[PDB]
């Protein structure tokens, strides 16, 4: 079965590739204000040491993880001013300059779809207090949120060089410096890497970019119409808050002492029977600091896994061409572009589909007068009646021809040669 | 607050609302102390000055979000000055704003990277993402190499850690046998 | 780990020969016992924090040997997965807990504009270039293969013909040499 037509397949992928950056301050999450709590804190200020090192590992981490999935290349391209691409049309995913950003329309619907519900100015936490919000209590006990290093708009910066240079340049610009080429010429490059000859494309150019075109649009409404697609970025947002406020609920535990208070206890004891449950009560807090950030060093192995295979795909993808099956999207891949979306990115991944096959009788060589022949690259098909000679990928049979094929011995050996004339010029 | 309550608490138990006995009104109590003060500074053995990087507070606020007024008049420098510098992040002190940008030395945040420059200080500016490079484009035009490079890249990997064995016998109990006698019921966790 | 002995845990004193000298065992057992649990939970933290970052080594030894067959023992397709450019060899080097990869890699260095047509019409009928582009100088067209410039006379071996040469948009009209 060969087939006879194909399909421009865009898949949307989505990768986190960060976590927001978390810092915690021991003396007013355990002792929250009180000296004499803190003074007993101070023998277990090791632990602490430990603790904010390696919050503190985590938060560079992330900056990292951001750096090597969108700082692949230095050279931050500009698209042209015209747009002539053959046909394929790229507004969608291209920058808008009528934004106070760069963000193209589909990064600003990644960006509608995700809530991120976090910056709050300290300051209007002391005024309405009443409304109980749960980043002011965080705050105040000593649970504060790094921002991420590179801004939005400048990853969106990022993601829109690396767009410019492979529609300007194809993958050239991945080794090295940037190369120019109209953009049919690298998608004949593309089919020519998946096994179909560039002849095609030309004569289904139209065709395909309106294919492409229609694929992105098919994107569009697909991310206009329900959130669950960005469901792995939300969970990571949502979960690392959940975890916070854990921890502040957390606070609310004896650990065997006579109430969760600090001040209660130094009110009704005083400092001769308060030093244990105070020590009780930091023996706890410290403990449950310790849980929070061992799961978020495991929250950070995770992502550091996804980041590394967000910057493998960058890198095999974006930058080049995969022949590797199922990596970047299902069927053959032809290229990928970026898109920007909170802690994490988006493939929009393009493959060729073969869509109409055909049944085909084929034998595996042809024995002329004595010598078999095979296809230098394709199958023998038959259409019921004669032969030809066919690429795999698509129907575009041509007549045998000692060019076509090649001879190897006599055809007593070969299992299911079958009888016919080849053309010789 | 009913007239049988006085005192208010919040998720974490903290009291947090108390009716004043005195004069019948509700106060609300918050820390006097905040986090979010980062300090920026480059390696002792160049230079003791630093910057104060205040999260989530225009530096107008900063003298009461801090309490400066209580503080000592080393720390009411970085308090206010000729060298505020706002930034998405929060605001910063004892720096200079730069409107050059160069590569990121020391990460503030929000896009906003500092650095010890000359007269030596530290100043902050906006990191740039590297050259500009805009790339002809036309339908009928390509580039072809003509000549080539061999370049020899190196990459590190870590293979391994050191192995490393804990007796919690000698640890916990470094030479005394009621310590170890005590630690038997606690096997289960040493053998784990 | 050393460093975290000297923490009471709630007990009179960090040193167990204090507490066995002050107390008897009558009342130095609970001591014994809150100092025992505060040095568990310090051992358990420290071998957490080793599995985590074994975890760490493990994914980045599993990178060193995919990286030690697919470049070492063989040639990489794979973009930017073993230095900048496109792949030649790789050499290991062993380093203290780690490998060194030595990365030998093409790079392009010299580009030069060319004008170029997706195809040929000879005498109707379009010819695409097997392996290569066809680029002009300015007046004659010539085959070349794509990462290195080096042009030959347009030939019915070096190209294909396919159909006739309406359909395809922004060929050019030249003569091809036929042997
Ligand atoms: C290959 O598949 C495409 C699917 O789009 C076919 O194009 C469609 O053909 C029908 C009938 O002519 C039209 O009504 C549609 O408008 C076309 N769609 C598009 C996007 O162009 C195409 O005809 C098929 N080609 C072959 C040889 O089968
Ligand atoms: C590429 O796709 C868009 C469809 O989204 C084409 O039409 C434009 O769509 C945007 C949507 O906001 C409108 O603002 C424009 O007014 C539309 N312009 C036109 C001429 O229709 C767009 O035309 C396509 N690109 C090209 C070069 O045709
Ligand atoms: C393909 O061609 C060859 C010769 O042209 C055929 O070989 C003959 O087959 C018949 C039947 O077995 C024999 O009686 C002849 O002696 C063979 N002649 C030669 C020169 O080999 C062969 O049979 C043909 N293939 C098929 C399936 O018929
Ligand atoms: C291609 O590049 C190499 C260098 O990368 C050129 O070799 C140099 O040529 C100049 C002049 O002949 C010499 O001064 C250098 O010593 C050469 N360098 C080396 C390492 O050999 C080479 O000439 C270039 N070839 C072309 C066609 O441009
Ligand atoms: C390429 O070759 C074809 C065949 O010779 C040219 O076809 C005609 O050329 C004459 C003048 O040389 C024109 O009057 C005709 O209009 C052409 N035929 C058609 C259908 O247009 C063709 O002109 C050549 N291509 C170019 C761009 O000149
Ligand atoms: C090909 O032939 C088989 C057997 O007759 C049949 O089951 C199958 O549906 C056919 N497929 C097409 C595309 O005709
Ligand atoms: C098979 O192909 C040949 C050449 O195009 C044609 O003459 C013949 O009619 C075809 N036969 C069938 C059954 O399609
Ligand atoms: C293919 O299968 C059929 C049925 O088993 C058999 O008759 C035929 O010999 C097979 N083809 C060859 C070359 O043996
Ligand atoms: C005494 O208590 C009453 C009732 O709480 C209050 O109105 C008054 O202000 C307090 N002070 C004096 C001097 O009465
Ligand atoms: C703090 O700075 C921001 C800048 O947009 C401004 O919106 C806000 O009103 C300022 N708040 C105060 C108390 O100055
Ligand atoms: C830097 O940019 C600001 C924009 O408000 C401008 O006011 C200032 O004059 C600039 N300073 C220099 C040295 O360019
Ligand atoms: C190739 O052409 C473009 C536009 O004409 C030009 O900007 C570029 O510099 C040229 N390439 C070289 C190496 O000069
Ligand atoms: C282009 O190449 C041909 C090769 O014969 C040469 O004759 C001609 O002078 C060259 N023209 C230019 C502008 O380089
Ligand atoms: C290529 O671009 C030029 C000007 O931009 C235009 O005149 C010409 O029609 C275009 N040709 C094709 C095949 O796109």
Same mark, same amino acid.
């Not at chain 2, 509700?26 to 920026?40: A, H, K, Q, R, W």
């Not at chain 2, 390696?43 to 107008?60: E, I, R």
């Given at each position: ?151 939005? *708009? ?161 890198? *095999? ?109 | ?153 190196? *990459? ?37």
């Amino acid at each position: 079965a060969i087939p006879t037509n194909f399909t421009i397949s865009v898949t949307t992928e989505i990768l986190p590739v960060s976590m927001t950056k978390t810092s915690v301050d021991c003396t007013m999450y355990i002792c929250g204000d009180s000296t004499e709590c803190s003074n007993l804190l101070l023998q277990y200020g090791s632990f602490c040491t430990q603790l904010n090192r390696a919050l503190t590992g985590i938060a560079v981490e992330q900056d990292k993880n951001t750096q090597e999935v969108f700082a692949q290349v230095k050279q931050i391209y500009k698209t042209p001013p015209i747009k002539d691409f053959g046909g394929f049309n790229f507004s969608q995913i291209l920058p808008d300059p009528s934004k106070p950003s760069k963000r193209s329309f589909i990064e600003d619907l990644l960006f509608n779809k995700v809530t991120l519900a976090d910056i709050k100015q300290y300051g209007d936490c002391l005024g309405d207090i009443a409304a109980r919000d749960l980043i002011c209590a965080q705050k105040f006990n000593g649970l504060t949120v790094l921002p991420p290093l590179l801004t939005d *708009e400048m990853i969106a910066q990022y993601t829109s060089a690396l767009l410019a240079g492979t529609i300007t340049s194809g993958w050239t610009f991945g080794a090295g410096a940037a190369l120019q080429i109209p953009f049919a010429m690298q998608m004949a490059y593309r089919f020519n890497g998946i096994g179909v000859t560039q002849n095609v494309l030309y004569e289904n150019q139209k065709l395909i970019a309106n294919q492409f075109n229609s694929a992105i649009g098919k994107i569009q409404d697909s991310l206009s119409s329900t959130a669950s697609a960005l469901g792995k970025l939300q969970d990571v947002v949502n979960q690392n808050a959940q975890a916070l406020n854990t921890l502040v609920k957390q606070l609310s535990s004896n650990f065997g002492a006579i109430s969760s208070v600090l001040n209660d206890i130094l009110s009704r004891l005083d400092k001769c029977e308060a030093e244990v449950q105070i020590d009780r009560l930091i023996t706890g807090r410290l403990q449950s600091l310790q849980t929070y950030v061992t799961q978020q060093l495991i929250r950070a192995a995770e992502i550091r896994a996804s980041a590394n295979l967000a910057a493998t795909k960058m890198s *095999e993808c974006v930058l080049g061409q995969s022949k590797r099956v199922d990596f970047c999207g299902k069927g053959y891949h032809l290229m990928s572009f970026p898109q920007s979306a909170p802690h994490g990115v988006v493939f929009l991944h393009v493959t060729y589909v073969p869509a109409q096959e055909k049944n085909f009788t084929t034998a595996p060589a042809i024995c002329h007068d004595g010598k078999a022949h095979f296809p230098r690259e394709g199958v023998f098909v038959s259409n019921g009646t004669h032969w030809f000679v066919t690429q795999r990928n698509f129907y575009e049979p041509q007549i045998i021809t000692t060019d076509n094929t090649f001879v190897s011995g006599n055809c007593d050996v070969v299992i299911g040669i079958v009888n016919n004339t080849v053309y010789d010029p | 607050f009913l007239p049988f309550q006085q005192f208010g608490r919040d998720i974490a138990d903290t009291t947090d609302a108390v009716r004043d006995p005195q004069t019948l009104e509700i106060l609300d109590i918050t820390p006097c102390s905040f986090g979010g003060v980062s300090v920026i500074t480059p390696g002792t053995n160049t230079s003791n000055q630093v910057a104060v990087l205040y999260q989530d507070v225009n530096c107008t606020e900063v003298p009461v979000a801090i309490h400066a007024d209580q503080l000592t008049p080393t720390w009411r420098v970085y308090s206010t000055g000729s060298n505020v510098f706002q930034t998405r992040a929060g605001c910063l002190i004892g720096a200079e704003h730069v409107n050059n940008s160069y590569e990121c030395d020391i990460p503030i945040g929000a896009g906003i990277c500092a650095s010890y420059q000359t007269s030596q200080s530290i100043i902050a500016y906006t990191m740039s993402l590297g050259a500009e490079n805009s790339v002809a484009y036309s339908n009928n035009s390509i580039a072809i190499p003509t000549n080539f490079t061999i370049s020899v890249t190196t *990459e590190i990997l870590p293979v391994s850690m050191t192995k490393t064995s804990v007796d919690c016998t000698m640890y916990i109990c470094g030479d005394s046998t009621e310590c170890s006698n005590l630690l038997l019921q606690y096997g289960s966790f040493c053998t784990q």
